[PDB]
Each structure stands twice: as structure tokens, then as C-alpha cells.
């Protein structure tokens, strides 16, 4: 029971987000629809935590489904791109059609059993993972907590990455 995915964001073995090779088809179509409607999307002003909408990714310049995580100053907010998993600060918000708000997030928050983490406590694991953003990893979902976060085992080319926390 191992599914292909890609680690898009890493904050540790306790907090990271991936993109299941399964949901890619849906995600692409989402992006397609968002790119064509973008220009004509209305301005978004209800700026408060948890507010769903469409924010502009400073790097891409493209708008994506986002959730306001923290309201800062000068109309700048830290937002979380639900279909990716990374956050950013921006000032560009446009409304998200209800039709396009129905789908589920396309990036899944995961973590490894904390009970099996660190034998040497590897912070170089961050490096090992980031060095391979362009690569395909594998996960076996042990469960999904009431929060939506999967508890998982991480694999790279058949090898369990936890092995990178010990000798």
C-alpha cells in the first residue's frame, strides 16, 4: 500500500505536506480553471483567519486557492496554499467561486509516528528532502487524525527515510 507523491513542503518529520500522484489530475484541472478565470475574479476583502479565497503566489505571480493564516499590516496576510502546502505573504486577494471551493485540498499534511523519530535527531533530514524536491517519494498512510493529517511512513526509492535519523 505505497502511493507515489512529491514532498512540496517540509518543516520536519512532524510537519510536512505532499502531493499524491492520485490527486494530480484533479489539481491540474483546478489550476487550469483558475488560470482562465483569474483575470475576471472579483476583489476579496473579508480578510480574517481561516478565510478561504484566492491569493497570489509572490514567486509565481499566479493566483491559487488559499486560506488566511494570519492577518498582518498593510493588507498583507500570511496565507496557506491548500493545494500545495507552503505559505507566503501577499496583498493580492480575489474571490474563489463556490464551484471551485468544493474540491478538497490537493496537498496533504503528514507526519511520522513521533514515537519512532530521532535516534540521533537528524536536522540534516531537511536537507536530504529539499535536495530532492524534483523527485518522487512514496508514502503508506497509516491513518489520518481527526485533523486531516495523515500519520505516515516515508520512502525514497524503497528506502525508509527514518534511516536518516539514525546510523
Amino acid at each position: 500500500e505505497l502511493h507515489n507523491c512529491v514532498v512540496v513542503q517540509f518543516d520536519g518529520p512532524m510537519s510536512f505536506y505532499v502531493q499524491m500522484e492520485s490527486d494530480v489530475p484533479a489539481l491540474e484541472q483546478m489550476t487550469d480553471k483558475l488560470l482562465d478565470a483569474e483575470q475576471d475574479l472579483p476583489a476579496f476583502s473579508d480578510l480574517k483567519e481561516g478565510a478561504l479565497c484566492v491569493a497570489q503566489f509572490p514567486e509565481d505571480e499566479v493566483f491559487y486557492r488559499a486560506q488566511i493564516r494570519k492577518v498582518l499590516d498593510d493588507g498583507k496576510c500570511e496565507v496557506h496554499f491548500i493545494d500545495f502546502g507552503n505559505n507566503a505573504v501577499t496583498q493580492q486577494f480575489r474571490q474563489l467561486p463556490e464551484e471551485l471551493a468544493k474540491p478538497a485540498r490537493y496537498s496533504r499534511h503528514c507526519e511520522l509516528d513521533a514515537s519512532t523519530i530521532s535516534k540521533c535527531d537528524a536536522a540534516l533530514l531537511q536537507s536530504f528532502i529539499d535536495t530532492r524536491f524534483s523527485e518522487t517519494f512514496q508514502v503508506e498512510i497509516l491513518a489520518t487524525k481527526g485533523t486531516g493529517t495523515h500519520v505516515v511512513r516515508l520512502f525514497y526509492q524503497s528506502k525508509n527515510i527514518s534511516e536518516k535519523l539514525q546510523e
Binding site: 489550476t31 505571480e61 499566479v62
Partner: peptide, 6 residues
């Protein structure tokens, strides 16, 4: 990349 933008 992945479902990003063009």
C-alpha cells in the same frame, strides 16, 4: 513543478 502556472 506541479499544477503551478502557465
Amino acid at each position: 513543478a506541479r499544477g503551478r502556472g502557465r
